[PDB]
Amino acid sequence: EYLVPLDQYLAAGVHIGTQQKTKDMKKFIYRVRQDGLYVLDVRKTDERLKVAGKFLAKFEPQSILAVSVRLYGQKPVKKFGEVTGARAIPGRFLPGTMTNPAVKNFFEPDVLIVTDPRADHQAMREAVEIGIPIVALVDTENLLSYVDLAIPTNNKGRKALALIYWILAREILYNRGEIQSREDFKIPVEEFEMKIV
Amino acid sequence: ARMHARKRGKSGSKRPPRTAPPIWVEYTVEEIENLVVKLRKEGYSTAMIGTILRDQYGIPSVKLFKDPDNPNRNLTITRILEKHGLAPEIPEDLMFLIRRAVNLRKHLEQHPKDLHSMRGLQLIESKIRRLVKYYKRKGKLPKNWRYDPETAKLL
Amino acid sequence: MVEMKFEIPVCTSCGREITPREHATHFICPNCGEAVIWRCESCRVLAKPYKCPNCGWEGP
Amino acid sequence: SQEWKEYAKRVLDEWEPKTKLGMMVKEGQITDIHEIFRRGYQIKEPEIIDVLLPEVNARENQEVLDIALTVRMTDSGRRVRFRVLAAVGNRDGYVGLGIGHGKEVGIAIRKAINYAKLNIIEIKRGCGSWECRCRRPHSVPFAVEGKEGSVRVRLIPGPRGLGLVIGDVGKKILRLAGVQDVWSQTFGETRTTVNFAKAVFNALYNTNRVAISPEMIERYGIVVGRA
Amino acid sequence: MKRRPRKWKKKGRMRWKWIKKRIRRLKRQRKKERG
Amino acid sequence: KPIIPMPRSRFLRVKCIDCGNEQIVFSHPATKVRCLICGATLVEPTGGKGIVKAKILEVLE
Amino acid sequence: TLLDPLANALSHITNSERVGKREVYIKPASKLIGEVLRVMQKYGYIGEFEFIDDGRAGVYRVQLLGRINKAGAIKPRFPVKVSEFEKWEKRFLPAFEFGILIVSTSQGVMSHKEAIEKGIGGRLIAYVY
RNA sequence: CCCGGGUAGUCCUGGCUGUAAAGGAUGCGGGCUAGGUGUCGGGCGAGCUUCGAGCUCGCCCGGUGCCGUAGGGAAGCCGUUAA
RNA sequence: AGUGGUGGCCACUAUUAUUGGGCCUAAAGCGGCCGUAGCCGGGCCCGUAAGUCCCUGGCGAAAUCCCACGGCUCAACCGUGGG
C-alpha cells in the first residue's frame, strides 16, 4: 500500500539520487544507474515517512520547528507550518537561536525537522546543545550521524520537497484525528511547490 | 612478497574449506597415480604437474584425497613422486634457484658494471642459502652438502 | 534514611548507561508507539541502528 | 536546611523561567537533581540548580581555585584581564567547575561561579580499596583516570581516614565532590593549576563511564550521587 | 664528526658550515706541527 | 571484507567442439587447456578468467 | 608476521568494544583461545560464541554484551604461586576483585578467583575487567 | 654582489675517498580500527564501439594524494599511507 | 633541650623508566640494504615431565624485624610463645 501513486513519486523526482553513495545508506539505496546517479528505495521511503507521520502527531502543534535554508524548500516549510500549526523558519538560520535566551526569537522545541543535513549543520549543533530529537530529510549524499528519524529521498528538487511535505501534513493530521480521511485535504501539491518568477 | 621487496601485495589464491573430495571427480586415486607418473615421466616438476592436472583434468587438488598407505596423511604429488622413485633429490625450488643463479652469474660475467644485478645476485644467494640452512635443520640433504658456484655449474 | 535508588537510563543500541552530561536523547518506539528508545552519542555519531524491544522495528 | 528551602522559595517566586527546563522545575514537575542529568537535557539558567540544590549557595561550598592576570598586547598599551577559575559543589556527590573572564576581580568571580553552576555533574562514590571494602561511599568506588592536555591524573581507591593523597587543587575538588580518601598519581606537569583542575574534573566524570554490575553496586555500595 | 642539527639554527651564531671548516683548518695545522 | 574466503573461481563442465569431448576445466587457468583427443585448445590463460572458446555445459563449484 | 593469537584476539575485542559493534570474528582461533572465551563467558562478559571451521585455522564468532572496560593479554606469562595474587591483581585491575585474571594451571586454563579457592598457582595469560 | 676572461673541475677509462637538510627531520614486521573522493596499475561486471580493454560507470586488490568521524597530542597538526 | 650551616646517601625523579620514560617541530631512528649468534615466533594429534605448579623431610645458626603475654614505674630493653 502506498500513500501516493508510485508513478506520481517517480515523476516527483523522489527516487532520483546523486552520483554518490555512502556506507550509512547502503540499505536505503536501491540501485545504481549506468550513468552514475544513485537510486533510493521507494517503499522504504514510504514506510519511513508514514512512520514519521505516526510520530509527529504525538507532539504539540506549535512545539515542532521546521527549517529549510535550501531555497527550494522555504515555501514547502512555510506551508507545512501553516497547515499543521508548527513553527517555521526559512532562510538563514540565525546562529544561537535555541541556545541563546537573550535573543528576540528564543524558542526551544521538543523535536527538529531538517531539510538538508549538510546545509543545516548549525541547526543540528544548536538543537544538540539543547539536546532534542532530530528528524531529517536525507539524500544518498547526506550523513546519518546525529539523526533520530531520517527519511530517504531527493532533498533538492522542488517537486519532491512539496510532495513529501504534503504527505507529512496528511499523515500528521491523520494521526491527530482532526482529519480522518486522505480525501479531506483540498490543498493540492502546487500550494506547497515553488513558483518560478 | 614482503620479505625483501617489502610490498604487502596480495596476489595469493584461495581454496574453499572442503574436507571430503567432491563427487564429480570421475577419477580415483589409482587413476591420478597413473596420470601423475605419466606427467613426471614427460619431464615436469610438481608445480606444473598440479597446475595442468587442476586445469585440463579438472581435479581441484590432490590434497583432498587420503593416501591409502596411511590414514593420517592426505595424498600429495610429492609423496606420489616419492612412491615410484620419481621425486627429485634436491628439492625442486632450490634446483630452480641454482639454475637461475648460474644464469645470472654468466650474464654478470659478460656485464660487470650492472651493480643492480650484483644486488640481485646477493639476494638470490641469500635465498638459496636460507632454504639450504632450513633443509639442513630438517636433514633432507647430506650434511657435507654446501653450495659452490662450480658444482652449480655442474648442476 | 530511605535509599534513593533511581533507574539510571540505559542506551538501547549498545547497552551502555548514559553518563550524566551526555547530551543523549529519548524518543518513543517507532512502529507501535509505546517503548521509550534511548540513544547515546556512542550510538548516534556512528548512528548504528536501534531495534525496538516490542515490534522488532530497526532503524537509525 | 530550612534556610535552603527559604532561598529556594525566594528564587522560585523571583526567577522567571525562560528555558524549556525552567518550567518543570518552577512548575514542580521536576524536583530531583538527578532528574535533569538522567534524561540528557541541557542547562542554561543557573537559577535552575539552586532550586533543587540550593546548598550550592553556601559560602564554604564555593571554592576559588586560582586567579590569573592574562595580558593582551595592543598597539596602545597592555590591557590586563582576570581569568579566574573556581569550583562549587555539594558534599553529596554534585560539584562543578567554572572559568570566568573579567575586568575586575568581582565580575570574573561571579561569571566563573555561574558557569561552574552550569557545569554541574553527578558523582558515583564507594569503597574499593584492597583493605577497607566497607561498602560505604567514603571513597571513589574504583580506580579511574582523567586526561586534559599534558596532564593525566589517575585516582585509586583508598581506605578510610587516609585523607586526600593528592595535590591541593585535587584536594579541593574532591572535598567538594564528597570524597575523602584516595591515592592519586600524575603524569605531566601540574604547575598549570587550571589543567590540573580540569583533569580531576575529567576523572570524576569518567567514574560514571565505567561499566558495573549490581553485584558490584552491593559490594562497594555504589551511591549514584546523593547519599 | 657527527654534527648536531641544533647548531644549524643561525640564532646568535655563525654559519655552521664555516665553523666546521675552521675546526678542520685548525686540525690540519695541529696534526702537521705534531708530525 | 568476507570473513571466510570464498574462491572467485568456479569449475566448468564443457563440451569440446571438434571431437565431442566432455571435460572439467578451470575458470582462471594459469596455463593452456587442450582437448584429450583432438588436442585443440579449450581455454586461454590471461590476467583473469580464462578465454573460453568451446561451449560451457554446466557450472560446478 | 603473526606470532601470538591471544593478544591479537583480546586487542581485537577491545577495539571492537570502544566502537561497540555487535559481532566479531577472531580469525586466529585455537583451542586455548576457545577455553579462554569460555572463561569470561562463565561471567557473561560476552554473549554466545561459536567455532567456524574455515579449513585453515578456524574462526571464532563472538557477540559482545558491552561490558568490557579493557581486556589485555599478559604477554610474558608470569608464573605466580597462590599466596601473592594480590600483587599481580593490583598490577592489572582497578579495584578489589573488579574483574578477573586468567591463569593456566596444572588442571586447565581458567579464571583466578576459583584458582585461589582451589588454591593452585599457575601462569598468568590474560586480564580483563 | 654586475661585467670581460680564465686554471682544477665538470666527460671516457681504472682505483681510491664512504660524505649531504642522503629530510617524510617519522627503524622495520603482524592484528584491529567511521567515512568521502582521484589518479596509477592488475582483475572482474555493466554501458559505448568508426571493433583497438579503443571510450563512460560499479566493485576487489596494491601504490599515490586530498578532505575527514572517533581518537591522539603543548600546540603546530596527525588520523587506516597514524604521530 | 634542641635548633642552625656544610658535606655524602635514598625519596622527590616515570631526570634511569621490567612495574614505568621519550626519539616529525623541543637532544635523541644510522643514508640504504644482507645476515651470523642472540631474542621473539601459526594451529592440530602422541609422549615427556626440563621449566611451571601443589603436597611432603632435611637445611638456610644466633642477635636484629612483626605480633600477644610477663619483668624492669611505663617505655626502650630483656624473657616465653607464633610468624
Curated annotation (Swiss-Prot), chain A:
Key word Acetylation present: no
Source superkingdom: Archaea
GO molecular function terms attached to this record: structural constituent of ribosome
Keyword Ribosomal protein: yes
Keyword line: Ribonucleoprotein, Ribosomal protein
UniProt cross-references to Pfam families, sorted A to Z: Ribosomal_S2
One cellular-component annotation, GO: small ribosomal subunit
GO biological process: translation
Subunit structure: Part of the 30S ribosomal subunit.
Protein's name according to its UniProt entry: Small ribosomal subunit protein uS2
Originating organism: Pyrococcus furiosus (strain ATCC 43587 / DSM 3638 / JCM 8422 / Vc1)
Record lineage: Archaea, Methanobacteriati, Methanobacteriota, Thermococci, Thermococcales
Curated annotation (Swiss-Prot), chain B:
Residue ranges, annotated region (Disordered): 1-20
Cysteine pairs bridged by disulfides in the record: none
PROSITE patterns cross-referenced by the UniProt entry: RIBOSOMAL_S15 (PS00362)
GO cellular component term of the entry, any: cytosolic small ribosomal subunit
Comp. bias (Basic residues): 1-17
Keyword check for Ribosomal protein: yes
Alphabetized UniProt keyword annotations: Ribonucleoprotein, Ribosomal protein
GO terms classed as biological process: translation
MF GO annotations: small ribosomal subunit rRNA binding; structural constituent of ribosome
InterPro entries, alphabetized: Ribosomal_uS15 (IPR000589), Ribosomal_uS15_arc_euk (IPR023029), Ribosomal_uS15_N (IPR012606), uS15_NS1_RNA-bd_sf (IPR009068)
Family: Belongs to the universal ribosomal protein uS15 family.
HAMAP family in the record: Ribosomal_uS15_A
Subunit structure: Part of the 30S ribosomal subunit.
Name this polypeptide is given: Small ribosomal subunit protein uS15
Curated annotation (Swiss-Prot), chain D:
GO BP, sorted A to Z: translation
GO terms, molecular function: rRNA binding; structural constituent of ribosome
InterPro entries cross-referenced by the UniProt entry: Ribosomal_Su5_D2-typ_SF, Ribosomal_uS5, Ribosomal_uS5_arc, Ribosomal_uS5_C, Ribosomal_uS5_euk/arc, Ribosomal_uS5_N, Ribosomal_uS5_N_CS, Ribsml_uS5_D2-typ_fold_subgr
Keyword rRNA-binding: yes
Record keyword Ligase present: no
Domain S5 DRBM: 60-123
Domain of life: Archaea
An annotated GO cellular component: cytosolic small ribosomal subunit
Family in the record: Belongs to the universal ribosomal protein uS5 family.
Family matches, as PANTHER family: 40S RIBOSOMAL PROTEIN S2, RIBOSOMAL S SUBUNIT
Domain observations: The N-terminal domain interacts with the head of the 30S subunit; the C-terminal domain interacts with the body and contacts protein S4. The interaction surface between S4 and S5 is involved in control of translational fidelity.
Subunit structure: Part of the 30S ribosomal subunit. Contacts protein S4.
NCBIfam families, A to Z: PRK04044.1, uS5_euk_arch
Official protein name in the record: Small ribosomal subunit protein uS5
Source species of the chain: Pyrococcus furiosus (strain ATCC 43587 / DSM 3638 / JCM 8422 / Vc1)
Curated annotation (Swiss-Prot), chain F:
Family the UniProt entry places it in: Belongs to the eukaryotic ribosomal protein eS27 family.
Binding positions (Zn(2+)): C16, C19, C35, C38
Zinc finger annotations (C4-type) as residue ranges: 16-38
Names of the cofactor(s): Zn(2+)
Cofactor annotation remark: Binds 1 zinc ion per subunit.
GO aspect biological process, one term: translation
GO cellular component, one term: ribosome
GO MF terms, alphabetically ordered: structural constituent of ribosome; zinc ion binding
UniProt keyword terms in alphabetical order: Metal-binding, Ribonucleoprotein, Ribosomal protein, Zinc, Zinc-finger
Claim: ATP-binding is one of the keywords in the record: no
UniProt-recorded name of the protein: Small ribosomal subunit protein eS27
NCBIfam families the UniProt entry points to: PRK00415.1 (NF001629)
Gene: rps27e
InterPro entries: Ribosomal_eS27, Ribosomal_eS27_Zn-bd_dom_sf, Ribosomal_zn-bd
PROSITE patterns: RIBOSOMAL_S27E (PS01168)
Source organism: Pyrococcus furiosus (strain ATCC 43587 / DSM 3638 / JCM 8422 / Vc1)
Subunit structure: Part of the 30S ribosomal subunit.
